[PDB]
């Protein structure tokens with residue numbers, strides 16, 4: 045017998061400002077690092093960018109009405125820092141705050157709980173220009189000032205907040221892989237920026253305790269649970285290294301305020317460890333979150349990797365199946381195809397049991413409630429005559445992940461809610477518009493902007509029924 | 519770039535009173551549960567028992583002289599509770615205390631550090647008769663009286679103490695598998711006795727802080743780190759279940775004072791969870807140890823197990839290779855042969871890398887120092903003419919584990935010491951005398967005590983050389 049989903053389970057869906065909003069230069073909004081980066085040649089799929097995106101800034105009333113029609117309990121969205129502080133630092137842009145206030149009002153007038161993400165990768169370019177953004181401790185005081193602004197303004201109406209969305213992704217992609225702004229490939233700078241981002245996260249959680257005493261806050265981590273390829277001791281050891289280096293490196297800091305020792309000693313042996321200042325540990329250890337936010341798409345299987353072995357690998361940004369290649373850390377671990385799971389056209393593993401495994405690992409290790417802040421299936425969709433989008437693949441993906449969440453709840457994992465990625469189709473940072481996640485199809489592609497009209501997919505109605513029965517019918 | 523062993527790394531060897539001492543009814547000693555159990559037909563290999571064992575009680579001066587020849591830094595032994603309290607909880611037998619006083623003085627006169635195990639499975643039979651020993655909360659106060667008696671007598675001279683040796687083994691073998699006293703096969707009774715043993719462990723650690731404020735104390739857990747068979751998600755999940763039910767169930771209590779929640783909920787679902795009294799959680803959470811004691815011999819590889827699958831398996835007690843069979847918990851996991859490791863004649867896996875993995879898991883999860891209180895190879899030995907025993911198989915086994923310990927120290931695991939099982943050959947509880955672990959061969963077998971003469975094996979001189987070079991020369 046499964047436990048039921050708890051009565052006030054937050055059935056949600058999610059978006060991110062740069063990927064949906066558009067209006068990139070309207071109503072006083074400043075330049076963000078993604079405004080600049082996406083316009084650089086070769087950075088994005090077919091030169092796509094978020095100048096217009098799906099124009100949610102102008103169509104939010106229509107979108108929220110589709111949320112209300114679906115019966116969403118919660119909508120997760122991010123605030124565009126550059127809309128609120130065009131220069132990151134100076135005067136507040138009241139037109140910017142007014143849009144999110146209008147959005148929050150619309151959500152609550154339809155009975156939808158807002159989940160606000162403070163940071164979803166769009167730091168104002170002025171801060172990058174002024175002092176290198178996340179590579180400078182000044183961003184701690186500046187990020188704090190921006191979050192306290194939002195706390196003060198909306199703390200009375202928003203109860204659930206996410207600090208940093210996938211710190212491990214925007215730090216790693218921006219400073220090690222060079223696939224995000226600032227486009228750097230420097231492991232030393234990566235760990236310095238990562239450490240500063242850790243301090244920023246802790247500082248705003250502390251500020252949150254003053255300004256929103258009745259609220260709940262936490263970071264959202266991009267969690268790929270690691271698997272060993274097999275029972276060979278050297279591959280299990282590679283799995284130990286991979287979980288500590290890819291996952292504990294962040295989640296131990298979030299939950300305990302401490303970096304894991306084996307990864308630290310390994311970085312220190314190379315001069316790659318971050319610069320710690322007095323007070324850093326006191327701050328990191330005095331900032332307990334209310335939950336661990338988890339963005340989950342797939343697990344990763346690993347095996348042993350020689351000191352001269354695999355480093356950077358090819359990532360599939362085209363939807364042409366089978367084109368990604370193994371990546372790893374020489375000497376520590378390398379990824380390997382898991383022969384027991386299917387994969388998407390972008391080579392992502394489909395592993396819903398992996399989600400239960402991951403929820404169990406976090407509960408068992410940190411004893412924290414979990415808010416699943418992202419999960420979903422990115423695939424091609426076909427619009428059919430009669431406004432029909434038959435996305436059975438997406439229904440079956442979500443169905444199996446929701447089923448494993450109920451098992452994890454039965455196993456004792458305190459899951460506060462589930463936010464599917466995404467409510468409407470939106471711009472994928474590196475994959476363009478063809479890689480669709482929405483319950484609501486948006487009428488545009490990578491060649492033509494068309495009319496951006498919204499069309500309900502088969503999965504919209506499936507998820508509507510899930511919410512109505514509180515998950516009893518999947 | 520390996521780190522050296524620390525300057526005062528405790529290079530040790532170990533024994534246990536019932537396996538080594540003999541003199542089972544001399545100098546006022548009372549009956550233990552093992553004196554009674556091993557004399558029951560069918561309970562032990564060929565009816566062997568520890569009436570004489572290897573007569574360490576009379577020959578301790580010879581044995582310590584051999585330890586000094588070897589250059590042992592530390593000797594781990596257990597105190598026979600029935601020597602000190604013949605009826606478990608009445609008047610003290612001073613002759614019993616005098617033996618351990620002579621032993622400790624003999625060790626310290628040769629510069630060897632005593633490591634005292636309070637409990638190595640031999641609770642006096644009078645407590646079993648009076649109230650069922652570990653199934654009664656009365657044992658908490660009776661074990662405390664015994665522990666404080668030793669703390670006050672020897673605390674000036676012994677700084678390293680172990681509370682319960684392998685609680686997971688003597689509780690599960692005595693109350694679930696029926697292979698140790700009291701021979702019970704009842705899962706509910708097992709978890710009750712286990713919870714009482716947790717309370718007794720916490721209580722003596724609390725007392726220790728008062729009576730030996732400068733000492734170090736910890737439990738010694740029988741740790742078999744679990745592996746998934748492959749990357750099939752269902753087998754990784756079986757691995758999560760196995761590591762939680764077999765390892766976290768004890769080590770989380772030792773380190774954090776809490777049972778893991780998924781295992782608790784599963785037991786609670788069948789009414790097998792232990793009876794928790796008010797005050798229990800407070801006691802368990804207020805008894806932090808100085809180290810995790812780790813008894814390591816092998817890893818275990820697991821795969822999924824259907825609800826009608828494998829339960830109890832066959833254990834090898836004869837030294838005939840390939841006679842063990844799979845065991846598991848239906849619905850959760852079953853053990854499976856790991857094709858990547860060798861096995862002994864008793865079907866124990868040989869996995870030195872698994873020790874590194876196990877050390878890393880404890881350090882990463884609990885941030886505790888580790889004292890390896892047991893590790894060694896049980897095998898047939900042949901005495902050759904001229905009193906020669908060439909146990910190159912044992913040297914190879916020990917060498918590879920000591921190498922993996924050094925790599926774990928380099929990873930940042932704080933390892934305090936290493937006690938090889940065992941200093942001399944001794945009685946294996948269920949395997950008789952032919953399953954030998956010693957650096958020192960004892961001339962006897964299952965059929966004759968012979969002259970009990972001590973004979974240094976090749977591994978004796980190998981370890982002497984390890985200690986002399988502080989592990990630089992393996």
Ligand SMILES: O=P(O)(O)OC[C@H]1O[C@@H](O)[C@H](O)[C@@H](O)[C@H]1O
Pocket residue numbers: 060063209210213266339418422465471472473474475479
């Ligand atoms: O768009 P992708 O690369 O398919 O990833 C899908 C999603 O998962 C995370 O990485 C991001 O937080 C989202 O913004 C979104 O990008």
Ligand SMILES: O=P(O)(O)OC[C@H]1O[C@@H](O)[C@H](O)[C@@H](O)[C@H]1O
Pocket residue numbers: 534537683684687740813892896939945946947948949953
């Ligand atoms: O003697 P065995 O069964 O080979 O195991 C070897 C050792 O196992 C450990 O569990 C016990 O603490 C030791 O007393 C010793 O028995």
